[PDB]
Amino acid sequence: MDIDPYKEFGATVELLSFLPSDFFPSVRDLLDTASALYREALESPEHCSPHHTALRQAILCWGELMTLATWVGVNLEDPASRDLVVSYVNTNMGLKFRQLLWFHISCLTFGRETVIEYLVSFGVWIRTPPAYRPPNAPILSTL
Amino acid sequence: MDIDPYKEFGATVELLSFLPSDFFPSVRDLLDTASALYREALESPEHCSPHHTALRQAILCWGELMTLATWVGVNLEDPASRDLVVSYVNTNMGLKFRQLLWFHISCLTFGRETVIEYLVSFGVWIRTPPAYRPPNAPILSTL
Amino acid sequence: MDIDPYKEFGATVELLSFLPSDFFPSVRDLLDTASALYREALESPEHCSPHHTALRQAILCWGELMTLATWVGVNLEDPASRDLVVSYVNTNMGLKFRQLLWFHISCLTFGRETVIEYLVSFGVWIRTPPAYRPPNAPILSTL
Amino acid sequence: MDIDPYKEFGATVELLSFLPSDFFPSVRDLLDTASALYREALESPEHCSPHHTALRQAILCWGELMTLATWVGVNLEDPASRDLVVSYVNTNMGLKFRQLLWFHISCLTFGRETVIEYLVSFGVWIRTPPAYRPPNAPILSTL
Ligand SMILES: COCCOCCOCCOc1ccc(C(C)(C)CC(C)(C)C)cc1
Ligand SMILES: COCCOCCOCCOc1ccc(C(C)(C)CC(C)(C)C)cc1
Ligand SMILES: COCCOCCOCCOc1ccc(C(C)(C)CC(C)(C)C)cc1
Ligand SMILES: COCCOCCOCCOc1ccc(C(C)(C)CC(C)(C)C)cc1
């Protein structure tokens, strides 16, 4: 079916493509962050939050994709296709994964309205010209 | 992270290992059941329930895995690799997909208590040797 | 008929003639901004605002002009005339279009009074010669 | 963004398609009418009505297209290109322009409900076979 993984939260793919693809941190970095900050609540037997649920399912899915790609590469004999699997994964699905993880982690941490206003402001900013925008890229802080 | 996609909901992979592997319906049947009973909810912008929050993500994961295997079978001129990848997807991950779909659809339709009782009772019925096994296995029913 | 597209909103062309070309984001950027911030209200059957109405009509104009430029590229076998028409369209019409899109988005975003005070101040700043005006221009920003 | 210029007023492209392309008056005639009837308003500094706003924007776009056509006629020596461009502009873009002009002038003048009932009645007419199609095609009146 046609589902938007964010509209149950108050966002949309059209709104997260409003940021450059070179903005979203790497998958490994986001997973490390997620461990460090919410391992005890993702591994928890509680409906702690919809973000927790969705993040769990996403992590399991990335793990299964990784498993599959490693298996294909290990079985295949020639590199041309022993690589193309993991390569295409990190190309097309890595972006979706890290957009979604960024969303969920950032929300759980800072706030949903904050993350949304940040998306909007950062798009407006990265689209405005430098002479007439503030010079420092926007960023999220708990400090 | 070792996440159990069920302990959040009050279960485990073990409790679901009582059911054999050939017990679980086809992914087509289960996707049809979902599109029938819970579509307006899985497309809604609401946290209708953690079951929905999980089912949306799992369906997106399955779609992306399908796209992967298809792009593979297409761009890979080795039909052996095509077949192996796309059918191993089924072999290994479809069983998990349909376990999770079964669990969620059944805890939505009938309930958590009813489903866990069903799991216990079916485990009894199946661990029981045949000679003493009644032919009327437990079936989940609203009627 | 001597129509001023801002006289209805309390502004004028003479008040936006000071804003240079390097001030206005690209057409693509402004369109993405609108699509991300106001799509569910520009595609809506409500009279959400004069700015919404005007944005709708201007986007329709621009879409038809892009259709024209495509038809040109396809039906004009004179590369010179073809490229000259396309460049005229883009440069001139997109400059006017960026001007108007900016006015409307900025108003909807900040306020009519804020946008007009900002225009007055930017005019003061841009009339001042460089030897007596600060180097850092005024700035309209949510941040 | 896919936008319907009539959906905020209470109609739909699929509804004004009931009327043939050779039904709408000349752009000349429609502009004469709009001038004579609402010039003091389309030149006004007031959101007199959404129809007024939309008409302002449309007439501005038509004026820019006229300026384009003159620029072509003077610059481009290639007669085939010049004429093809002017003809495309007038024919197609003016078909759309006079659809819009007609809708807005007619609404402002007679009424939205009147215009929509007229659309459905004209559909009835044009659908009725010529053996039973009265020659008195429906027409909008204030009497
Ligand atoms: C080969 O099957 C063995 C059955 O035992 C399952 C053991 O693993 C636990 C399965 O749990 C899941 C369920 C779903 C999933 C996701 C959400 C990632 C969906 C999937 C598998 C379709 C990608 C991941 C793990
Ligand atoms: C190259 O990526 C472009 C961005 O795509 C935009 C998103 O398109 C709609 C679908 O979005 C998602 C988001 C996440 C996912 C899941 C949860 C399955 C995770 C993933 C991407 C790791 C497979 C699937 C689809
Ligand atoms: C070839 O003509 C097709 C007839 O129109 C079918 C309906 O198309 C819907 C779009 O309608 C309009 C109407 C007006 C316009 C504007 C106001 C932008 C004016 C125009 C046509 C001069 C560009 C754009 C689209
Ligand atoms: C070439 O641009 C120079 C700057 O403009 C100077 C005059 O400013 C007045 C702007 O007038 C318009 C006219 C039309 C428009 C719309 C939005 C209808 C778009 C267009 C140009 C595609 C017709 C916008 C502004």
Residue numbers in the entry:
A (entry chain C), B (entry chain D), C (entry chain B), D (entry chain A): 1 to 143
What did the paper state?
The envelope with the surface proteins surrounds an icosahedral capsid that is formed by 240 copies of the core protein (HBc). The building block of the capsids are dimers of HBc, which consist of an N-terminal alpha-helical assembly domain and a largely unstructured C-terminal domain (CTD). While the ARD is projecting towards the capsid interior, the NTD forms the capsid shell with protruding dimeric spikes that contact the membranous envelope. Instead, most of the mutations with a secretion phenotype map to a hydrophobic pocket in the center of the spikes below the SS-bridge in the rigid part of the assembly domain.
Finally, we wondered whether the binding of TX100 affected binding of peptides at the tips of the spikes of the CLPs. To test this, we chose a minimal peptide binder “SLLGRM”, which binds only to the CD-spikes but not to the AB-spikes in CLPs of wt HBc. To establish whether TX100 affects the binding of “SLLGRM” by forcing Phe-97 into conformation 2, we added an excess of TX100 together with “SLLGRM” to wt HBc-CLPs before vitrification and imaging. The map showed that all pockets were occupied by TX100 and that all Phe-97 had changed their conformation into “conformation 2”. “SLLGRM” bound to the tips of the CD-spikes but not to those of the AB-spikes. Thus, forcing Phe-97 into “conformation 2” was not sufficient to enable the binding of “SLLGRM” to the AB-spikes or abolish binding of “SLLGRM” to the CD-spikes. Furthermore, forcing Phe-97 into “conformation 2” by binding of TX100 has no noticeable effect on binding of the minimal peptide binder “SLLGRM”. Thus, the binding sites at the tips of the spikes and in the hydrophobic pocket have no obvious conformational cross-talk and can be targeted independently or simultaneously.
